[PDB]
Amino acid sequence: GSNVADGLAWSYYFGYLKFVLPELEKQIEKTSKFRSKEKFVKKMFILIPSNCFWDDKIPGSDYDPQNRITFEGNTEPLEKTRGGVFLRHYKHSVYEIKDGENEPWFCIMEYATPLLTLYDMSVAQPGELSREERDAQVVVFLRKLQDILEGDRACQGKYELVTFSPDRDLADVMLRKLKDSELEIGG
Amino acid sequence: GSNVADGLAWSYYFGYLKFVLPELEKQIEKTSKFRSKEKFVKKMFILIPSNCFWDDKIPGSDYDPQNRITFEGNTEPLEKTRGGVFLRHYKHSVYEIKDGENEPWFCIMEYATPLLTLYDMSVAQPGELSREERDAQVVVFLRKLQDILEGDRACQGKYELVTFSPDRDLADVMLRKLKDSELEIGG
Ligand SMILES: Nc1nc2c(ncn2[C@@H]2O[C@@H]3COP(=O)(O)O[C@H]4[C@@H](O)[C@H](n5cnc6c(=O)[nH]c(N)nc65)O[C@@H]4COP(=O)(O)O[C@H]3[C@H]2O)c(=O)[nH]1
């Protein structure tokens, strides 16, 4: 078959999200700077650009035209060996997002890395995955990932999927989602 | 859909095999000990047990009942960042395989890591993937991986897929494949 998105979503979960998401808040709290910070939403914001592509660096990127996003630092690494085959270390990037004259937000942002495979396939093997087929697979990936994560009680409230077109301002998108997050001051 | 194997094979390729396989021989040759060794087949032997499972350590494992496999060392690491999201280091394990009184072989062996996801699914989400459905997905994974790798000229002669039942002696299986490999003394 050609429905690559199903496999991408399941491996994204079992090979990463399943064990990083429940532990994320605790990992963040291991850093005093992060304990001290208010307006720090602890959910992982998983970024899903409709074009399966992004600048390697989020701050100042085409998705950040107003330069309101700044890299703050990384969380303390989680160590895990995968079936005794290879060793992995997992850590996440914290970003500051400006909110005018108010206190800026801190948040966890990450592009959905399985999208790299969709993009690579469309460029290296166009016969297997056309641009239009890639577009559709993004949607399939999103819907399956939603089903998987929503089926895991341990992941509840630990993430937020963010879909957007490449013409959008990520800072604006994120600011709105951060304000709509459950986190209140002192929380 | 439920055909997870397709996605597993494509990401295994684009996220790993596509860039490690063409460089493998060169990476191995960076170590003098490996340059000096004869009967060192430079192909990556990708192990695909029919049950999607293995002991973390290959030497002395249930797949090595005669204790003829020994860990020798790792290849020099390859560094690569994945879309600016996370940093990876790739390296491979070299094993010695006893050949009676003759000179023992050196080889590169590693289990097909996407099988971890198939196994994890069958145990954690049996409703999504039954034992019997997992068995079938192994076959789908194998055949799709074959199609992908055979379609990449840069990967030609750089790998060998090894399928076996868990009751088999991996040392016997490997000895057979090493002798049948193209590599000749001084090659
Ligand atoms: N943001 C973020 N995302 C992460 C991280 N770790 C994994 N992911 C995402 O989850 C996908 C599946 O990871 P996997 O279970 O290890 O599945 C792996 C694994 O089975 C295999 N593979 C990758 N690296 C190695 C390796 O070094 N050695 C071996 N033997 N297999 C590898 O290729 C498969 C697909 O690799 P990926 O393309 O990278 O695809 C990964 C990646 O998109 C992380 O630390 N941060």
From Swiss-Prot, chains A, B:
It comes from the Eukaryota. It is found in: Endoplasmic reticulum membrane. Residues 3-187 are cytoplasmic. 2',3'-cGAMP binds at residues 16, 82, 88-89, 113. 3',3'-c-di-GMP binds at residues 16, 82, 88, 110-113. Homodimer. Belongs to the TMEM173 family. Sensor of cytosolic DNA from bacteria and viruses that promotes autophagy. Acts by recognizing and binding cyclic GMP-AMP (cGAMP), a messenger produced by CGAS in response to DNA in the cytosol. Following cGAMP-binding, promotes the formation of autophagosomes, leading to target cytosolic DNA for degradation by the lysosome. Exhibits guanine base-specific ligand recognition. Binds 3'-3'linked cGAMP, 2'-3' linked cGAMP and 3'-3' linked c-di-GMP with much greater affinity as compared to 3'-3' linked c-di-AMP. This is Stimulator of interferon genes protein. It comes from Nematostella vectensis (Starlet sea anemone). The chain holds residues 193 to 377 of 377 of the full protein.
